[PDB]
Design a protein around this nucleic acid. Sequence first.
RNA 1: CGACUCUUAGCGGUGGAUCACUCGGCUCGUGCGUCGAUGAAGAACGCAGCUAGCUGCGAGAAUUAAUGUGAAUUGCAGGACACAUUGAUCAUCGACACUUCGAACGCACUUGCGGCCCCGGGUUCCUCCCGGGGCUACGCCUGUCUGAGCGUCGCU
RNA 2: CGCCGCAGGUGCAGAUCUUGGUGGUAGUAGCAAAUAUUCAAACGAGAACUUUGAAGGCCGAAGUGGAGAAGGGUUCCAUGU
RNA 3: CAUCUAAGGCUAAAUACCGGCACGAGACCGAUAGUCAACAAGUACCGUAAGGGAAAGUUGAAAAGAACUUUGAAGAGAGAG
RNA 4: CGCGACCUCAGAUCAGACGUGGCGACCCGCUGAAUUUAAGCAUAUUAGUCAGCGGAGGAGAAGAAACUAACCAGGAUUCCCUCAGUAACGGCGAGUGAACAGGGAAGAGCCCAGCGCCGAAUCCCCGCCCCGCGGCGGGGCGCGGGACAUGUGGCGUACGG
Lengths: 50, 86, 134, 135, 122, 52, 60, 105
Amino acid sequence: SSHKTFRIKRFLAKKQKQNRPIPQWIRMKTGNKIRYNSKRRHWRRTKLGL
Amino acid sequence: TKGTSSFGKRRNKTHTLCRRCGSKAYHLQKSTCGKCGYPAKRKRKYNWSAKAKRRNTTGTGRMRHLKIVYRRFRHGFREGTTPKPK
Amino acid sequence: MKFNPFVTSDRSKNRKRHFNAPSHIRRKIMSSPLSKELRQKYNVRSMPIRKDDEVQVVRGHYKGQQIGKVVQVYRKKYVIYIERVQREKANGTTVHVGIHPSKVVITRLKLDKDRKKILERKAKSRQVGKEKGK
Amino acid sequence: GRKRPVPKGATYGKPVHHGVNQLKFARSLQSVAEERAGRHCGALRVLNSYWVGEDSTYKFFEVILIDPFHKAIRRNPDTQWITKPVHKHREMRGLTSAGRKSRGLGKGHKFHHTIGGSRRAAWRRRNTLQLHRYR
Amino acid sequence: AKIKARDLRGKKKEELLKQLDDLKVELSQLRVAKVTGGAASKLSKIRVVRKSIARVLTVINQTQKENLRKFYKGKKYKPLDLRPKKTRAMRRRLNKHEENLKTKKQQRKERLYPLRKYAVKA
Amino acid sequence: TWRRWHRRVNTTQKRYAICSALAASALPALVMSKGHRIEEVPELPLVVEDKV
Amino acid sequence: VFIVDVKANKHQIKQAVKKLYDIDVAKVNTLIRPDGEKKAYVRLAPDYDALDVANKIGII
Amino acid sequence: APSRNGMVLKPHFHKDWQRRVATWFNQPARKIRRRKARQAKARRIAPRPASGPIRPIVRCPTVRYHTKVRAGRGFSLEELRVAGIHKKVARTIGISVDPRRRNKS
RNA sequence: CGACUCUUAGCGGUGGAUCACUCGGCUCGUGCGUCGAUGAAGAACGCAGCUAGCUGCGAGAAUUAAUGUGAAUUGCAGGACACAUUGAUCAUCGACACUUCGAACGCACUUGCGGCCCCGGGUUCCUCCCGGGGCUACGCCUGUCUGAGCGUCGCU
RNA sequence: CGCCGCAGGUGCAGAUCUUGGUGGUAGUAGCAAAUAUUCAAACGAGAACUUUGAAGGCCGAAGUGGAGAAGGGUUCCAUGU
RNA sequence: CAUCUAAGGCUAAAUACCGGCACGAGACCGAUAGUCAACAAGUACCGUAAGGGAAAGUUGAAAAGAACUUUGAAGAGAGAG
RNA sequence: CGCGACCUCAGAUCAGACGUGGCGACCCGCUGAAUUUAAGCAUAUUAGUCAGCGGAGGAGAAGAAACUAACCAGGAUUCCCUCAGUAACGGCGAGUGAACAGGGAAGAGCCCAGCGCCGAAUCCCCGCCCCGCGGCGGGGCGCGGGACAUGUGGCGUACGG
Ligand SMILES: [Mg+2]
Ligand SMILES: [Mg+2]
Ligand SMILES: [Mg+2]
Ligand SMILES: [Mg+2]
Ligand SMILES: [Mg+2]
Ligand SMILES: [Mg+2]
Ligand SMILES: [Mg+2]
Ligand SMILES: [Mg+2]
Ligand SMILES: [Mg+2]
Ligand SMILES: [Mg+2]
Ligand SMILES: [Mg+2]
Ligand SMILES: [Mg+2]
Ligand SMILES: [Mg+2]
Ligand SMILES: [Mg+2]
Ligand SMILES: [Mg+2]
Ligand SMILES: [Mg+2]
Ligand SMILES: [Mg+2]
Ligand SMILES: [Mg+2]
Ligand SMILES: [Mg+2]
Ligand SMILES: [Mg+2]
Ligand SMILES: [Mg+2]
Ligand SMILES: [Mg+2]
Ligand SMILES: [Mg+2]
Ligand SMILES: [Mg+2]
Ligand SMILES: [Mg+2]
Ligand SMILES: [Mg+2]
Ligand SMILES: [Mg+2]
Ligand SMILES: [Mg+2]
Ligand SMILES: [Mg+2]
Ligand SMILES: [Mg+2]
Ligand SMILES: [Mg+2]
Ligand SMILES: [Mg+2]
Ligand SMILES: [Mg+2]
Ligand SMILES: [Mg+2]
Ligand SMILES: [Mg+2]
Ligand SMILES: [Zn+2]
């Protein structure tokens, strides 16, 4: 809602910054074996526990 | 109707995030965490669930102090001494 | 054969220790043999590979006597790069080909105050072993 | 005595276990007194206790406690033993005189239940299957 | 232009703080340049300045701590961060003086009846 | 883990096998039948002095 | 407009801006971004000029 | 079910015996650990005879074993007295006095 | 004669069995056998030039110092780095530092609300505002100070 | 890998068996609750569905309108694919 | 007749160890096996919660990871390397 | 109708300490099932076991006889082999079930209270100085405080003193 506590908004804040695609230059690192952010989240598909 | 219609009127949280153990098991009305038991001092832990014990035991987290304690034991917990500067 | 009960002969442990080695003991793993003239003038067989010493490839596609200067040691990749050991890619530019330092022989070293000290310490140890083996 | 703390006096199954009222606690009331003083004063070490007149409904015991970090106790041998960490909360482990009596320890034919150092120590040893390498 | 902890250790706290200040203002303009685009060179000097601040702060924090340790040398009571830290259990034990002392009964028995070194022939 | 990995043999039987193995090492047909390439060796029960 | 620590109130923001930029501020309007960092709008005194200061800051 | 003809066997395996199973795979390791502690102890007491103090002659206390003799816990105070050595200095000599044994013979 | 359907074969797809490999387990054994109010385990939130996860770290934040080592790190860039008017990296780690919850400690879980004592500014001492620092949990031991009692007494 | 011995978590068609993959069904059922779309133009490789304009309609103020509370958590706004 | 001397206290060694630190080994398993987890695994995800809980290894010696020409709007092709 | 002594209590953000929580494989103290077996089932069994609560250490507990024995006697505890699936318990059904002696691993013994004697000989705390630091001790100095005769310390403990 519009009415939030500070600690909820700080929780929502972190979840926003870590829902970002991996940098493109990561693919070039030696022994990368990573391809995409597999922990990406969409607001409509899966909901936060909070 | 006990099915689809009844699921529409659920908009009141029963649990919130716990200050200790950070899990969303802090019952609002009871003011007690259902995961770590936090109105209380002693951490809630039962032997009838070994998976829950191993989900949150020692070593499942950062181990900030104890990981250096394991280091200092190998040298006898020495203090106030220096490596003899060049 | 191995008798010390505190050093392992396990294949998985040796491979794990080799591929996860820190940089400072990855440097020792990348040691390279010295030439016949370098072995006679000093008393040391193998020497860890440095940045700017000349070297010739003795195995692989790039065998020969073209004394090439080392231009980069890639301890992450366990390879070193040499001046003329290059390959042209599709676009036409040139890139170095990495070769394991065990497949090259050092012909001249890059000497500093530290290199001389390590050079002299290996010579004194072999001399000690030789006199014990009189 | 000890009443079994089951709601409405309902134990379930095996009428042998239907007992509620005439059941007795394994430890004496003196052991309970030392535990209650030891749990309150967690910074002191219970030494011993005695009896000072009971009641119809109460029993009164005086419990001797030792401060393990007083210098008068620390700087005097024959008392440094209680300052050692293995001697903390003796009354909870049944090491006090009152706590010991409920364990069935002793020498002789009367006390074969605790021949391993405790009742559980004896039970484990005589219920463990020794599977030697060569059988 | 690089600073080292070894050469910082001779200066007084008056210009050590002075050196920390202009080191902090330099990091302020560095973060400004990072926001306004700036250059790859200026971005790379952010880390070199951050470590320089830690270097200067470590020296003043150390220098203060050895002065406090020297001041409380021989004091009966010292602050909790100046007394040894080893382990809560190891701090509870008895010291060498009150671990090794014996009752007069025990040492009289030791004086009277010491363990003799002996052998038996065949 | 309690699979009875070990077996105990009687001491008399164990000595019996050792005696049998020693007796077989002195017959060239048996040692050759083990594929040991002893054709140029003399005196099949082969003894050297203690200098070795 | 600056980005400030979430633990700094408008008084410390005003003192910090006034001392480390040698300007006089009129009021501070603060908000915490959805990212989780504070944003401070620092209105300068009428005798100061933001463009003048923003030049000296380097954010022009 | 009994098949034809055998022992009436009563195995004592009704008590969840597989948690209290003592395996002996550390038997050879224990023998070494005890062996080298014996060697270390013997070399610590350099001239002392490496195997504890002297023990008395002792008769086994039952009609099944009273024909044989063995080594008891230690010498009794009456044998120490008539040998003219003090009960306190005896154990420093390596004699192992046992004060609660009496001599009826 | 086509079409369709079936059988077999070649080739091509779908699929990921088989085989070979293994920085992973499982089992056994050995030596140690060490947490915490000097604030643990655990959680939260932050920290990279470009960084989401994992990892490491704590406002000195993918680390400071010190010591060994001795020219790298590396996906790109950058500037270093005389390697002696002292050194990249890595390792070790004994100096320093170590945010917020948490036994969690001023009260409460709303970054809600206090109290006392010092310091600096606004004061231009008088104490109102702002900032900084240190205290303010419960139980309990020894001692200290202050006390209560028509408790037992002594002197008037 | 053969031969002499040793030891097995040693042989599958079934268990409405476990896991994974694949068929016929089958280009089939279906994409039918709440009246309704049409003309021209623009962008564009591409228009029944986008946008603009013109028309015909519907919600008809107890709305298919304008705002909030819980709840969600960036879905808000620009630009580009 | 024998035997001990309760109702106070301490005491090492031989003994135990499926948690922890660091090691060594194996007639074990070999990616549906072996730990749930060989991999950003107690992760993704599910449940109000207690709690439940996966799937997922392999180019090549070396990226030398296909320049360049051509058709298509591109995916995608044909040559070339 | 005050001022003192003691006793019994109280307050303090008083000076200096201590406990709390975690892990818990092993160990100690409690509490404690039912499935299952008995071809049903209630005593019995499962089992003093799972689950539950408390307390520790590198081990823990035990431990130096109010013992075993009945012998020509042995001699703390703990562990191994054996005793022994035995004596015994048991709807004497299903089932349960030790100890002594013997051989080994290890081996170690002691301290109080009391009864007495010794001018409280005893102990803590705060200051002085110096010898020191390195987990903080020694020495002496205080017409310095307190504890303590409602009993501190030395001798001494069933083997006698
Ligand atoms: Mg939804
Ligand atoms: Mg409710
Ligand atoms: Mg060699
Ligand atoms: Mg029953
Ligand atoms: Mg005495
Ligand atoms: Mg606001
Ligand atoms: Mg075909
Ligand atoms: Mg095919
Ligand atoms: Mg450094
Ligand atoms: Mg409120
Ligand atoms: Mg009065
Ligand atoms: Mg099978
Ligand atoms: Mg098969
Ligand atoms: Mg099949
Ligand atoms: Mg159709
Ligand atoms: Mg239709
Ligand atoms: Mg209408
Ligand atoms: Mg939008
Ligand atoms: Mg698997
Ligand atoms: Mg496969
Ligand atoms: Mg799996
Ligand atoms: Mg896991
Ligand atoms: Mg205080
Ligand atoms: Mg039945
Ligand atoms: Mg049945
Ligand atoms: Mg039934
Ligand atoms: Mg249990
Ligand atoms: Mg505890
Ligand atoms: Mg003990
Ligand atoms: Mg004991
Ligand atoms: Mg028999
Ligand atoms: Mg039983
Ligand atoms: Mg022996
Ligand atoms: Mg006395
Ligand atoms: Mg006695
Ligand atoms: Zn919780």
